[model samples]
Target: RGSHMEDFVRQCFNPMIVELAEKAMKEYGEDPKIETNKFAAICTHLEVCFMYSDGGSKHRFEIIEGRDRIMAWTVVNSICNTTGVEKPKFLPDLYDYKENRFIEIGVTRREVHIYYLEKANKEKTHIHIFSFTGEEMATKADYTLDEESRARIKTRLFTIRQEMASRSLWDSFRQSE
Candidate 1:
């Protein structure tokens, strides 16, 4: 796909992460589709990414993943916090990584994205509700869920908390790292 189509895809879920990928392309090179952003400096030979953004200052990992992580639908993670600057105003109520002032309720939010949202899959719409997992920012312990499912929820937890990011700052941060 062209850059325009790729940009459209990024806009669908995370324009912020698209900005991250753009930076990744710039620093890493004009080639190589950038996925993760937290390891640009440390991981020299990495073609694909498996690192977090600049959180070396010891901030809790807020603004994790807001979008779906199961399928091969979108590469964007919605609100993955690259800087780790957006500290939680209140300490997490549940586990060690939980943070507060994170993951606010929005009109765009839904338990299932099939019927609505920017990237709803209309064909599989029927099974979405039943197939979807806990999207609420609720701090309930999720030990019951399998390892992968629980891990995805952890990503979304940070994505939701990114309400503090400004539109301009978001673009700025992504462009840099």
Candidate 2:
């Protein structure tokens, strides 16, 4: 009976089954503008949630929260600083260093409700990264999901998973240098 129950829970009530539900709840409270941005959407799913402000000088500030904001901000800062291009605003109230360059940080907020799924003897937790980029904004990086972008991401993820599987590693690592 014990084994049967465990199997039933694993197969029918696994945590994976509730992953989408949890995501939906978090997404529900996010700002509509930020939610619709392609880049913001991808960053949210990737768990990268931060933005940087460009203030015309060598010194720039990064505002990071949640997994997605941190990752995206780090990447943008590194590339922009290294290449000497003005950092683009991901949020409002940012000062554009150059006439053509506009940049700001994005605001991140936590979800009000918590959702989860249980399977076997384990439980899975969910997180959502909401944004407030809905107001009128200038053109920036393409965050829209075109066929090419989707295909590219799929291919990239497949390669990444394949590499991880071959190495028997189940952890993730990120670094900014």
Candidate 3:
């Protein structure tokens, strides 16, 4: 019930969803099928709760309380990082090493690796891999989210059911009962 929550949903969540929908269409060659009504339902259904903290302890963070939604963004963004779809603007430009080209050494989830490569033969030339232990990329590092819960939520949110059979594979496109 604050302007901050409204601002977040408007500026961050909506734009991310729209980008995802467009991406799905362009890559999958089909509509993501997120209906207008269903989209609005999701926005209203997901409650944004706020809590206050004290002293140096009061860094604001977001936690999706229930298994009603999947922040699929975590996985998708990592995929983008590895596949060269996007560069990590969240990191310092020093990581880019403009003096030479850099390649993301896709190692582990939530861990970042960038090594400068020799321009001529594409050989690894520098050892400047910064391990991200507690950095915020999409959300705060300390946000509370159980991995199992997130997986279940993702399944519930996306998994399509058949009516003995169905045409659309996307759950968002399924016909209303």
Best by TM-score: 1
lDDT of 1: 0.29
RMSD of each: 16.3, 17.4, 16.1
The stretch of ten residues in a row with the least summed lDDT in candidate 1 is 122-131
lDDT of 2 by residue, 72-176 (tens): 567657655765655554422222333323232222222211111111112111112122212111123322223453344334334433543454431321110
What overall lDDT goes with each candidate model? 0.29, 0.31, 0.28
Q: Is candidate 1 or candidate 3 better by TM-score?
A: 1
lDDT of 2 at 127: 18
Task: Quantify how close model 1 is to the true structure by its C-alpha RMSD in Å.
Answer: 16.3
Estimated TM-score for each candidate? 0.23, 0.22, 0.21
What's the CA RMSD of model 2 in angstroms? 17.4
Candidate 1: residue 4 Cα off by (Å): 6.5
lDDT for model 2, please. Answer: 0.31
Q: Each model's number of backbone clashes? A: 11, 21, 0
For model 2, what is the error of residue 135's alpha carbon versus the real structure, in angstroms, after optimal superposition? 23
TM-score of 3: 0.21
> For residue 46, what is the lDDT in candidate 3?
31
Give the candidate number with the greatest lDDT. 2
